[PDB]
Amino acid sequence: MMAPVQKQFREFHDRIKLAQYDENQTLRDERDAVLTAVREGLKKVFADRGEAAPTFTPFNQGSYAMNTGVKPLEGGEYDIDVGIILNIAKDDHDPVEVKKWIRDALKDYGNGAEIRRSCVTVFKPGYHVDLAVYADPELSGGTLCIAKGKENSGDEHRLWQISDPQGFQDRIASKLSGDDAAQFRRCIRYLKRWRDFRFSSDGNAAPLGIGLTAAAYWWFQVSKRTDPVSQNVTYDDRDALEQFVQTMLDNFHDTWDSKDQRSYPRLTVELPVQPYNDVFEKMTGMQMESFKSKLQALLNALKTAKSRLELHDACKALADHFGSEFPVPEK
User: Fold this and answer.
1) Ligand-binding site membership of 224 (annotated)
2) 119 marked ligand binding residue
3) Which residues bind ATP 3 (predicted)?
4) Cβ 215 vs Cβ 227: under 8 Å
5) What whole-number distance in Å separates Cα of residue 102 and Cα of residue 46?
6) Is residue 61 a known part of a binding site?
7) CA–CA separation, 128 vs 131, rounded Å?
8) CA angle centred on 23, ends 206 and 31, rounded to 5°
9) Terminus-to-terminus CA distance in the chain, angstroms?
């Protein structure tokens, strides 16, 4: 019979997983250090403009909140994500000016703060912290809106966009339960490491991690066998990934580009909460074509790793796509 690889997938998962906020005091300390720095810097910035310092409520976001965190590759950085809800009315403030408040509050913290399209990012040796900045729902008509735009943007690209990070986190945490939910989380982490490993030559071309997570929310199916007599359950991560990657490939659509006068294959993945946008909408046709080509090659490897006599060959076929931390036993 062909070599199984379930034990090597579980070992790979143990190697790549990074503990979520609730189980990771180091990440809590680093997050909280940045939040105390923003309180200190806000007292400074708003005392300098004769106004009372605005207050904020922080909350956990991103993969360290949803228990889908992966360790970076060497030379990579941890990505600590937090939202802060300022006690302001969105209709009274430009979103970029508000982000300027936060960045100036973090002027001399670590390696300096920086205003991105989605957030204020602060850098330290080994990690960055993304602060997504929101206006107060109570003062802004009951909607949670994130500050979009940077210092570059014209009026069209400076906006308070309706957002629901906690809704998205809840959807990911609740899609399944128990050992089924554990397989779901493992397969998201496997594809996050695939993303890091096979998109390193051009990071700007990589699919957003939130995009792969939303794709899993739409299309992941548990793969397990239940012995009908003993009721014993054994999970099959290789098959779960094979069915999920084939479902994503099935959902690419050749999409005509009038500028280039050609088609590009495009995968559309809607967020299952507000604003329900296609998360991959900013990827170019060329990046999509390369995304689809690497997904097809991953699928081919997953099928190869079902039909090897030698565990070595099955594992090496997977390691070609998941990288040097995927276990390859000696022949």
Assistant:
1) no
2) yes
3) 117-119, 150
4) no
5) 11
6) yes
7) 10
8) 65
9) 17
